[PDB]
Amino acid sequence: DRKGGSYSQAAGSDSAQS
Amino acid sequence: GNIFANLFKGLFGKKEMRILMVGLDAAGKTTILYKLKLGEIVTTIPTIGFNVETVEYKNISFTVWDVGGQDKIRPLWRHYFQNTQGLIFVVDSNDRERVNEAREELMRMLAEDELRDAVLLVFANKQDLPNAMNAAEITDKLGLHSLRHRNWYIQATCATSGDGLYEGLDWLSNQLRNQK
Amino acid sequence: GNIFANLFKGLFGKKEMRILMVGLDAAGKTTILYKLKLGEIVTTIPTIGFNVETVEYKNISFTVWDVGGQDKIRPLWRHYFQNTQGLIFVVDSNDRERVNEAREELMRMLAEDELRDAVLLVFANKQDLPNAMNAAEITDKLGLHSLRHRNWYIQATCATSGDGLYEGLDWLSNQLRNQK
Amino acid sequence: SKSSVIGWPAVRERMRRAEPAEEVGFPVTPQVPLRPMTYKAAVDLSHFLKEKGGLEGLIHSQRRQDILDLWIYHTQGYFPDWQNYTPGPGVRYPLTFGWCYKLVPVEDPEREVLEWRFDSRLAFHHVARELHPEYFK
Amino acid sequence: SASAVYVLDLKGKVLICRNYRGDVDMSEVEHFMPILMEKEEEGMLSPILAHGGVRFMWIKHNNLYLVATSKKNACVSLVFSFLYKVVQVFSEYFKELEEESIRDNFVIIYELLDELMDFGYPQTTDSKILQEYITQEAPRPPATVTNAVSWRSEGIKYRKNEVFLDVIEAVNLLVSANGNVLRSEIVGSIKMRVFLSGMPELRLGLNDKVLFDNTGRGKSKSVELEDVKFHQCVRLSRFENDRTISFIPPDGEFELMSYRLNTHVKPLIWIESVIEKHSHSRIEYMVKAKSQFKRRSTANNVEIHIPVPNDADSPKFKTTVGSVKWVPENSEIVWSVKSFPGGKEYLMRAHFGLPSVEAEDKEGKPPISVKFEIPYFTTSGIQVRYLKIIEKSGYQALPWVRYITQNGDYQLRTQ
Ligand SMILES: Nc1nc2c(ncn2[C@@H]2O[C@H](COP(=O)(O)OP(=O)(O)OP(=O)(O)O)[C@@H](O)[C@H]2O)c(=O)[nH]1
Ligand SMILES: Nc1nc2c(ncn2[C@@H]2O[C@H](COP(=O)(O)OP(=O)(O)OP(=O)(O)O)[C@@H](O)[C@H]2O)c(=O)[nH]1
Ligand SMILES: [Mg+2]
Ligand SMILES: [Mg+2]
């Protein structure tokens, strides 16, 4: 764990925008 | 599912209930809360922010959140309205000029869709001088009888004497708790 | 934590108590303090500043801080009010003109929020001439019965004779000390 | 997806309860990824909704669409932006390519009654993109 | 266009100086200290000094004044930027900014100063580039500085391609003594610590209001930053053209974007202060803290600083939640709370005496500031859409990002 918010995975781009 | 644990907890008392401390400044709200929690009239500094305390009576812990009647604290009563089940309004029967302000504040508080399930709790504060109104004149001036869909009860309590606090607490418990 | 040392100290006497020496000039305050500490009526110069002394009675060291009744020293009584637990007021029953001034000074001293936990200690000074009032007339003139939330006791003491000082000290100890 | 199957009946019941016409802050689950729904993910969600029912033929409403998007985000983490309808008036194609659900008239564009309809060709034909090339970038 | 940039000391001694143009005599540094002393004693002290026809601009450093004397009408903004770059380079190279490192790395410090700027015009400003050519423990200059890409060094190889982002949120509330918030602005901070192999070109994508409106998806929750500043590696052309945040991520921790817009929402923590201060008798601290944030978010390490009297002594604290400690150095009482869950109501009752003798001069009414910091909270509601990590060789990146919410200029005016 880490203070200030746990790290979360990020996507590559907006898949809904084509 | 099983509710044996819930029944066992409720057999000896599990309900707690809630309460709020709102009203005009110098209306005995802090004194009323101190009498409910401790039982003595202790002079306190003006409530710039808010006072948080809990009172246990009849096996129910009715926590009271004191709210000041200051202009900078009057609009802050909405912050304490969240996660609140009860609300007690302390009227200033000895302040005729501030009576209209207290009535307007009570109407504004009761005119919010968020504060709808909380029954009206009007306490006739300053009920120790001849200038203080009765349990019906104060309610009539504040229009407590016209608060439709709201269980409002007018009770006269003197901060110095402490009489009527038990009756008000019992009325609030009866309004909130509907069990034997 | 352990309080064995405190209990051992209190078993043989640990409480000390406090006292104050205030009043109008030439009201026997210095003479009263000298009688309490030494036990003789010794003539002293006017109290331009203040007198600091301690008196031990009944295993309690009741220190008395003499304060003059001069105009330049009357407003200086607030400096001695800090870190003070008791206050003894010496009235001038033989000074009818100065009786009003002494009453006003006592009312001003008792009308301060800082001096609230100190009980009233009214000593009928100059109780050796026929012009001196009794223990009730002086209190009635000074309005000691109207000092709400204050334990005021009127006692008549003669500086030359010294009678009544023991009774006043016992009353002060009873008011301050509430133990066996 | 057992969780998705379980949430589908509750989501459908909530959408049906809401007619066709209190807490502040933006809490985020710790370690939960957040990304827009993909074309394959949108197609799979549309197929699951069509199979389970409650999505095709239901009266399109802002509250129902918001509830469905919130349920989808809770169940899979997909952003509630791919379930968009094409600009009206008329049948609105899915905003995100691959979506098998679209809104069509059932009778001002706001006062027009819209209903969610399954569209298999939507997942393969970019009708919304063709209609609004500028919106597609 | 400073004539010579030098580093001073707390006693006026110049730790290190390096003339760049030679048009200003080095003896002007001695007169800088008396001028600063005179300005401080009269309230006319300014960072940009003026010694006759030569201006000696100085910056208050950690332990020494970075005095950059100039003679002509040089770019004041350029001089300030050069001083900031030099300070950043010194901080990167030396972990301590004081006299201990000033006189300990003089051999490398002189070389770094010479390489940084020549003739008053800075040339090298990249910390990594400077460290790749000048070290304290020399080869030809790196081609990265000569090449267009001066913020992403090529040839970097790593076992794993992991990037750690940080969604830093600063909640600043300017609440006046009347109870109304005047300045309520929230400044975003998108800082990513990219540590991968090669020089990937990051493709930043978030739920921007402008981007959503352009794409036709302007119906969900989108963050509309009033002011958005891109990083050095971020291409401004793509952002101006179609808001495409495409740039080469740097090697290490760097700030890609920093949102800055006003906030129209209620404060995260509502703090009301009551001052029951008697006339030289006692003081009352009726401090009540209300958590306006969501209950699912907890404000870790919440410290509501309530300024107590300057001469107050023997204070007593009567609170409910959170330890209260009075620091004589700070002359205030801070309502420190380890964990502050949203919706919590903390009430405190301070009581302390005052000296009998009144103060000779007034001390003012400093505003009350809180140090609430609730992580994993997105008050602005802006959610990152995707991060386009593309490399010529081709690799699968695993970027990470965390959202942190803290209190910035959240000062409440005292009564
Ligand atoms: N002495 C006295 N005061 C009373 C009585 N009834 C109501 N009060 C009022 O109760 C107040 C007590 O002050 P607080 O403890 O601060 O409570 P409050 O009335 O809500 O005032 P605030 O906290 O500042 O809003 C006094 O100022 C009085 O005006 C009474 O019978 N006797
Ligand atoms: N002789 C005599 N004097 C008395 C008697 N009762 C009170 N006094 C007064 O006590 C005073 C003694 O003077 P001080 O020792 O200075 O004490 P004080 O009355 O407080 O006077 P100051 O210290 O100046 O305030 C005399 O001036 C008298 O006026 C008494 O019974 N006999
Ligand atoms: Mg109060
Ligand atoms: Mg004397």
CATH code at position E74: 3.30.450.60
The three-class DSSP label of residue E243 is: coil
Report whether B144 belongs to an annotated binding site: no
**Which of the ligands is closest to the CA of residue B41?**
1
Q: Which residues surround ligand 4, an ion (CB under 5 A)?
A: C 30, 47, 66
**Taking CB atoms and an 8 Å cutoff, what residues of chain C touch E282?**
113-114
- Measure Cα distances from E283 to E310, E336, E414 in Å: 12, 20, 15
Q: How many helices (H) and strands (E) does chain B have?
A: 6, 6
Q: Is E34 on the interface with B (CB under 8 A)?
A: no
Report whether C156 belongs to an annotated binding site: no
E31 token code pair: 């007169």
E339 token code pair: 């964990």
Contacts of B111-117 with CB under 8 Å at 24 or more apart are: B112/B78, B112/B81, B114/B78, B114/B81, B114/B82, B114/D22, B115/B81, B115/B87, B116/B149, B117/B85
> How many Cα atoms within 13 Å fall on the side-chain side of residue C4?
2
- Measure Cα distances from E112 to C69, C121, E105, E163, E263 in Å: 78, 81, 10, 30, 43
D84 token code pair: 């968009």
A8 with D34: Cβ contact below 8 A? yes
Q: Is D125 on the interface with E (CB under 8 A)?
A: no
- Cα-to-chain-centroid distance, residue C98: 18
Do E269 and E335 touch, CB atoms closer than 8 A? no
Do E165 and E191 touch, CB atoms closer than 8 A? yes
**Which of the ligands is closest to the CA of residue B24?**
1
The residue from C70, C85, C155, C175 that is catalytic is C70
**Taking CB atoms and an 8 Å cutoff, what residues of chain E touch B21?**
none
| Gap between the Cα atoms of D137 and B27, Å rounded | 63
How was this one solved? cryo-EM
The three-class DSSP label of residue E307 is: coil
Triad D106, D109, D112: Cα angle to 5°: 30
Rg over CA atoms, chain B: 16
Resolution in A: 20.0
B28 token code pair: 């005995």
Nearest alpha-carbon partner for E257 in E223, E221, E232, E238 = E232
Q: Is D77 on the interface with A (CB under 8 A)?
A: no
Do D137 and A17 touch, CB atoms closer than 8 A? yes
The three-class DSSP label of residue E286 is: strand
| Gap between the Cα atoms of B27 and B106, Å rounded | 13
Tell me which residue range forms the domain holding E287: 269-375
What H or E segment, with its residue span, contains residue E128?
Answer: helix E127-133
D33 with A9: Cβ contact below 8 A? yes
Min Cα distance B52 → chain E (Å) is 6
Q: Which amino acid is at E20?
A: Y
Do E43 and E36 touch, CB atoms closer than 8 A? no
E401 with A6: Cβ contact below 8 A? no
| Gap between the Cα atoms of E302 and E337, Å rounded | 5
| Chain E residue with the nearest C-alpha to that of B83 | E343
Q: Which amino acid is at C121?
A: L
CB atoms near residue E357 (< 10 Å): 9
Report whether C66 belongs to an annotated binding site: no
- Measure Cα distances from E266 to B77, E175, E180, E365, E380 in Å: 13, 11, 11, 24, 12
Strands annotated E in E292-331: 298-306, 313-319, 323-327
Please enumerate in sequence order all residues whose Cβ is within 8 A of that of C2, keeping only pairs 6 or more positions apart, or say none.
Answer: none
Nearest alpha-carbon partner for C21 in C56, C53, C60, C59 = C53
Triad B69, E415, B99: Cα angle to 5°: 20
C-alpha dihedral, C110 to C111 to C112 to C118, nearest 10°: 20
**Does B98 contact ligand 1 (Cβ within 6 A)?**
no
Q: Which amino acid is at D132?
A: H
Please enumerate in sequence order all residues whose Cβ is within 8 A of that of B29, keeping only pairs 6 or more positions apart, or say none.
Answer: B21, B22, B23, B47, B66, B67, B68, B69, B88, B90, B125
Do C109 and C98 touch, CB atoms closer than 8 A? no
Nearest alpha-carbon partner for E304 in E329, E333, E339 = E333
| Gap between the Cα atoms of B67 and B22, Å rounded | 5
- Measure Cα distances from C58 to B19, C30, C154, D127 in Å: 51, 22, 21, 103
**Does B70 contact ligand 1 (Cβ within 6 A)?**
no
Nearest alpha-carbon partner for E167 in D32, A4, D25 = A4
| Gap between the Cα atoms of E299 and E301, Å rounded | 6
Do B90 and B126 touch, CB atoms closer than 8 A? no
What H or E segment, with its residue span, contains residue D127?
Answer: helix D127-131
**Does B29 contact ligand 1 (Cβ within 6 A)?**
yes
Min Cα distance C58 → chain E (Å) is 31
E135 token code pair: 């070290």
Please enumerate in sequence order all residues whose Cβ is within 8 A of that of E392, keeping only pairs 6 or more positions apart, or say none.
Answer: E198
Q: Dump the DSSP string for C5-62.
A: HHHHHHHS-----B--EEE-TTSSHHHHHHHHHT-S-------SSEEEEEEEETTEEE
What H or E segment, with its residue span, contains residue E213?
Answer: helix E209-215
Report whether B24 belongs to an annotated binding site: yes
Among C20, C25, C31, name the best residue to mutate to test ligand 2's pocket (greatest count of ligand atoms within 8 A of Cβ).
C31
Do E349 and E315 touch, CB atoms closer than 8 A? no
φ, ψ of residue E285 in degrees (nearest 5): -120, 85
CATH number where E287 lies: 2.60.40.1170
Q: Which amino acid is at E158?
A: Y
Quote the ligand 1 centre to B160 CA distance (angstroms). 9
CB atoms near residue B117 (< 10 Å): 10
CB atoms near residue E60 (< 10 Å): 9
B19 token code pair: 């309460």
Quote the ligand 1 centre to B30 CA distance (angstroms). 6
The three-class DSSP label of residue D14 is: helix
B103 token code pair: 């009535």
Nearest alpha-carbon partner for C80 in C47, C46, C104 = C47
What's the 3-state SS for C46-96? CCCCEEEEEEEECCEEEEEEEECCCCCCCCCHHHHHCCCCCCEEEEECCCH
Do B120 and B127 touch, CB atoms closer than 8 A? no
| Gap between the Cα atoms of C113 and E316, Å rounded | 18
